[PDB]
Design a protein around this ligand. Sequence first.
Ligand SMILES: CC(C)Nc1cc(Cl)nn2c(-c3ccc4n[nH]cc4c3)cnc12
Length: 377
Amino acid sequence: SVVIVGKISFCPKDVLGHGAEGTIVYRGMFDNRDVAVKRILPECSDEHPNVIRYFCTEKDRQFQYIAIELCAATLQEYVEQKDFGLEPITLLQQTTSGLAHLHSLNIVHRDLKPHNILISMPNAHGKIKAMISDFGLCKKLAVGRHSFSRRSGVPGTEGWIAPEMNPTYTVDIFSAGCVFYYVISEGSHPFGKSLQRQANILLGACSLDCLHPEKHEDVIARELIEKMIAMDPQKRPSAKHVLKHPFFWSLEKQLQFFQDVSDRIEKESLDGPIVKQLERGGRAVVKMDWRENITVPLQTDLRRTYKGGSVRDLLRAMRNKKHHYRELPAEVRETLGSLPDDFVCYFTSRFPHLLAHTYRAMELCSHERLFQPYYFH
Ligand SMILES: CC(C)Nc1cc(Cl)nn2c(-c3ccc4n[nH]cc4c3)cnc12
């Protein structure tokens, strides 16, 4: 009970799902890879680990057999029935890397959605990845079957309709924008419940109610996602921009940014654009007095003249106690914690808006070589 066509092999017993016009997909094999095999009546390279691969096509006297990179599940399955080593941020990163690659090839997906973002079978290293695919897979009620289609609409894909209702790359960034929130909110949409999304979208009526206003990780996510789903397409950042966002930075890269703008400043004028732009609106960020809001053993060690309401001075202080982290009393090293992880969290947990504030403020130096890893050109 095993059909062999060319390099493609499969067992007819193993049906993975069904499509249109007698289209079937089987669990199969190719080049010793576990692949999906779509047998179809015939109609009339530059790859990336995060776009689904189309390996091989083979024909008999009737059908065409296409070998597709096999997936373990659907993103909507990952997010909803969350009983699944790979974390949500890395998932989104891989997805954006795929999407950025497609965009470099002047390709636009037009229908990016949780059913389109596939979860790979674990490779030989036990690693799992995100895969952007043409066809979305859908909940069938059996074991184990799936619906596949390359169309928006179709049951049950509603709630995720092609935002084009000539498309530019901005329809994709908008789509991903919703997926980002879909993943972070563990299964909610930025424009509300299914029936009202279309109405809310067309009016830009979004609500990121899962992103707490005073929590650093949520604040950072909100900044990006808001811009991604911007009502005006021309306020939306390219896929490469999204990759540069602090949303994806490691705790080390975060702290390094902080230290970078700090170093960039200490010779600035306090009257000039750079520092003034950084201080505008910075009292809520610093919490009026940031010496009032850090742990007791630390403000004792500062007792230097840092302006308690100045963002610049806060950043300057963070820099010094990192540059002198070895020369510090053991009391203030254990309150600051390790470097950089505990160290940068020492502040961002207390000053939830510091990074996002400093990030947007320091766009005045985005064109500089110092801030190349933090901004896109
Ligand atoms: C074991 C299940 C969860 N894996 C898959 C089931 C189905 Cl129905 N399709 N599929 C694909 C797939 C991916 C792309 C396709 N284009 N046309 C048909 C396609 C099928 C990849 N991994 C699976």
